[PDB]
Design an enzyme around this catalytic site. Structure first.
Site, short mmCIF file in Angstrom:
data_model
loop_
_atom_site.label_atom_id
_atom_site.label_comp_id
_atom_site.label_asym_id
_atom_site.label_seq_id
_atom_site.Cartn_x
_atom_site.Cartn_y
_atom_site.Cartn_z
N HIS A 115 0.89 -1.11 -0.09
CA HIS A 115 -0.10 -0.20 -0.01
C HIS A 115 0.92 1.33 0.16
O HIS A 115 0.75 2.12 -0.78
CB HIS A 115 -1.06 0.02 1.36
CG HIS A 115 -1.92 1.06 1.37
ND1 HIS A 115 -3.21 1.14 1.02
CD2 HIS A 115 -1.48 2.57 1.81
CE1 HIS A 115 -3.64 2.24 1.22
NE2 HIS A 115 -2.67 2.98 1.53
N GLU B 249 -6.83 7.22 -2.08
CA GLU B 249 -7.06 5.74 -1.35
C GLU B 249 -7.44 4.85 -2.04
O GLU B 249 -6.79 3.49 -1.97
CB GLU B 249 -7.75 6.00 0.26
CG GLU B 249 -6.82 6.90 1.35
CD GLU B 249 -5.09 6.44 1.18
OE1 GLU B 249 -4.60 5.46 0.93
OE2 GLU B 249 -4.44 7.52 1.65
N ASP C 13 -9.10 14.72 10.41
CA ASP C 13 -8.97 13.82 11.34
C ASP C 13 -10.14 13.02 11.99
O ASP C 13 -10.02 11.78 12.34
CB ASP C 13 -8.00 14.01 12.66
CG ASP C 13 -6.65 14.77 11.90
OD1 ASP C 13 -6.32 14.23 11.12
OD2 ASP C 13 -5.94 15.33 13.01
O1 LIG Z 1 -3.59 9.22 7.46
C1 LIG Z 1 -3.88 10.10 7.74
C2 LIG Z 1 -4.94 10.92 7.48
C3 LIG Z 1 -5.08 10.98 6.03
C4 LIG Z 1 -6.28 11.70 5.63
C5 LIG Z 1 -7.02 12.62 6.63
O2 LIG Z 1 -7.83 13.27 6.15
C6 LIG Z 1 -9.08 12.68 5.77
N1 LIG Z 1 -9.56 11.81 6.03
C7 LIG Z 1 -10.62 11.54 5.23
N2 LIG Z 1 -11.80 10.56 5.21
C8 LIG Z 1 -12.76 10.45 4.24
C9 LIG Z 1 -12.71 11.49 3.56
C10 LIG Z 1 -12.03 12.47 3.56
C11 LIG Z 1 -10.94 12.65 4.20
S1 LIG Z 1 -9.55 13.93 4.48
C12 LIG Z 1 -6.66 12.43 7.73
C13 LIG Z 1 -5.51 11.88 8.63
ZN LIG Z 2 -3.02 5.24 2.14
#
Ligand SMILES: O=Cc1ccc(Oc2nc3ncccc3s2)cc1
Ligand SMILES: [Zn+2]
Ligand SMILES: [Yb+3]
Ligand SMILES: [Yb+3]
Length: 607
Positions: free
Chosen positions: A292, A315, A372
């Site tokens: 990954h 992702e 977060d």
């Molecule tokens: O790896 C750490 C990390 C990565 C991305 C993050 O922010 C997001 N997470 C989501 N989930 C769903 C939709 C949009 C987002 S944006 C926060 C922390």
């Molecule tokens: Zn990832």
């Protein structure tokens, strides 16, 4: 428009380069130094620009060798404070200037974790690590904290001489610090444009071992040997990933094994992937996380989401590439098993939030939402399920891998949105537009809950997990005698994990069934973190008091959120362990990762 950033957008000005010169002060828990940003105007007559800051102390801003006026706005929760800078001379479109900012970080920076000697493997030295994703780079330095801006960077980090600094960049040397002989300067170069969330720094008593022609594994002395064996398939995975996505442009592919409080499984930092030591299973069974992290060198690092609303682009494509790598190494039946497990994980995510929750949407609206807090299995799994559905709809893996390679090539070094991806998918599949017009796009992209279509999965490796799980669910007291250690003889570590995930979906089971599962399978002896986690969750949800010291231990000895967060929630939802969970959280809070401490506090509803 990026709703998570207070900085000037990319349409106003673009950061092209960062020259970072800093010193790591462990006694003060501060990073102090200068951030020289090469900024290019995108507008005529530009007289000011705004940068993102979060708990930073600003000493001064220097342009053309003189101090300039700047102003710090009111803090806007998790977004931080806007820093507006008054330029001494108005800029024309395409004009570039160098803005040097003298700054200091807060010891409470949400990007960093300062670990005392006691918190490390060696016990003689402190440690420091960063984690900027999604929006914590502003808590380290003033910047346009948005993935819509891609810059190159150089850095000079002064550290105690006995310690080693590493960054998400090519190592460019080390010298004694001329301003302090007890210190060492470490130099770094990142010549590939990156979004600022990919800036990363680690300071500690680090040692390395070569494991491939372009890979060193880094960790404290005590974990070097275990890590070298655990990640030995790294190079074979890079070769497969290069075959699927095109050239690896980053030069080096190093791995860093972090101390146990690292909040995620892995972090795709260019040139130096950060990983949790919870991957050190001893048999390479948790290597899918390396596949990954490798995949992100194309999907995420080269082709980036323009905003955090489009995080699924990063992702979804990374999981799709990850499962192809593992399918090349272990067979197509294995890719389908992992794909099917992923759907199971999506089902769990949708149940936890509720089928109407806005965070179950593929494309989210992060206006007034801390990224977060939004973070989950949804962008990974609903993103994977979409691509896997398209693969089957468009003619199989070979045809769809051709689209993926062309997608990476088309969007390399760019930041993109869902509409950009959709437009290119239709352009690429022009001879199959009628097929594409059958997809319920509004449901797939903009609706909450489970996807409107479930892809087709091969069941070969899953069947035995299902059969065993169902035997345990449908068993009555008088059937418990039939179970024996032989039930597991033909199951892999992966299949054992899937048996537990299947059983956990129907939890609680009767207490007597769980006491019997321990008696015949001895799951308490398994050190594999994925298995142990699911087994302890199943014990706590099924009300086994003996599991309380074991779940509490796992929740605090490591800090990978995937494990720590549901263990604390399970322990808080169990009446017998509720008070213990709350007290343990309270006692550990000050020495936890700031983001982990924040989220666990929210899940537990603690003051
Ligand atoms: O790896 C750490 C990390 C990565 C991305 C993050 O922010 C997001 N997470 C989501 N989930 C769903 C939709 C949009 C987002 S944006 C926060 C922390
Ligand atoms: Zn990832
Ligand atoms: Yb050099
Ligand atoms: Yb019976």
């Amino acid at each position: 428009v990026d709703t998570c950033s207070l900085a000037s957008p990319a349409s106003v000005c673009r950061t092209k380069h960062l020259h970072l010169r800093c010193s790591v002060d462990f006694t003060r828990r501060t990073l102090t130094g200068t951030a020289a940003l090469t900024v290019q105007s995108q507008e005529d007559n530009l007289r000011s620009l705004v940068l993102d800051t979060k708990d930073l102390t600003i000493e001064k801003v220097v342009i053309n060798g003189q101090e300039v006026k700047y102003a710090l706005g009111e803090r806007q929760s998790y977004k931080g404070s806007p820093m507006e800078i008054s330029l001494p001379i108005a800029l024309s479109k395409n004009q570039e200037i160098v803005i040097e900012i003298s700054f200091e970080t807060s010891p409470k920076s949400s990007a960093l974790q300062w670990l005392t000697p006691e918190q490390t493997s060696g016990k003689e030295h402190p440690y420091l690590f960063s984690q900027c994703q999604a929006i914590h780079c502003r808590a380290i330095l003033p910047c346009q904290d948005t993935p819509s801006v891609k810059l190159t960077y150089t850095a000079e980090v002064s550290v105690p001489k006995e310690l080693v600094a590493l960054m998400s960049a090519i190592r460019d040397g080390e010298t004694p610090d001329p301003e302090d002989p007890s210190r060492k300067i470490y130099k770094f170069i990142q010549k590939v444009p990156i979004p600022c969330y990919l800036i990363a720094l680690v300071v500690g008593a680090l040692e390395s071992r070569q494991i491939g022609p372009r890979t060193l594994v880094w960790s404290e002395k005590e974990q070097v040997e275990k890590s070298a064996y655990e990640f030995s398939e790294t190079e074979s995975m890079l070769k497969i990933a290069e075959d699927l996505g095109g050239p690896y442009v980053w030069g080096q592919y190093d791995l860093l094994v972090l101390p146990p409080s690292f909040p995620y499984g892995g972090m795709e930092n260019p040139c130096l992937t950060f990983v949790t030591p919870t991957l050190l299973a001893g048999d390479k069974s948790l290597s899918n996380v390396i596949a990954h992290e490798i995949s992100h060198s194309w999907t995420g690092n080269l082709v980036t989401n323009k905003t955090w609303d489009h995080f699924w682009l990063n992702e979804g494509h990374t999981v799709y590439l990850e499962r192809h790598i593992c399918g090349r190494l272990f067979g197509e039946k294995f890719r389908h098993f992992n794909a099917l497990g992923g759907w199971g994980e999506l089902q769990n995510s949708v149940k936890t939030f509720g089928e109407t929750h806005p965070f179950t949407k593929l494309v989210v609206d992060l206006t007034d939402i801390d990224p977060d807090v939004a973070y989950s299995s949804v962008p990974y799994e609903k993103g994977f399920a979409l691509l896997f559905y398209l693969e089957q709809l468009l003619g199989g893996p070979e045809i769809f891998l051709g689209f993926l390679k062309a997608y990476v090539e088309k969007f390399s070094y760019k930041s993109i949105t869902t509409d950009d991806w959709k437009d290119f998918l239709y352009s690429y599949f022009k001879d199959k537009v009628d097929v594409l017009n059958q997809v319920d796009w509004n449901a797939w992209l903009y609706s909450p809950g489970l996807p409107p279509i479930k892809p087709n999965y091969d069941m070969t490796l899953t069947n035995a997990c299902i059969a065993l799980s169902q035997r345990w669910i449908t068993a009555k007291e008088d059937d418990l005698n039939s179970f024996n250690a032989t039930d597991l003889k033909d199951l892999s570590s992966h299949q054992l994990n899937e048996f537990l995930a299947q059983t956990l979906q129907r939890a609680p089971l009767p207490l007597g069934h769980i006491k019997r599962m321990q008696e015949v399978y001895n799951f308490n002896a398994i050190n594999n973190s994925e298995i142990r986690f699911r087994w302890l969750r199943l014990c706590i949800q099924s009300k086994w008091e003996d599991a309380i010291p074991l779940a509490l231990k796992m929740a605090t000895e490591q800090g990978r959120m995937k494990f720590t967060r549901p263990l604390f929630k399970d322990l808080a939802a169990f009446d017998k362990s509720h008070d213990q969970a709350v007290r343990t959280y309270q006692e550990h809070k000050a020495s936890m990762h700031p983001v982990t401490a924040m989220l666990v506090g929210k899940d537990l509803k603690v003051d």
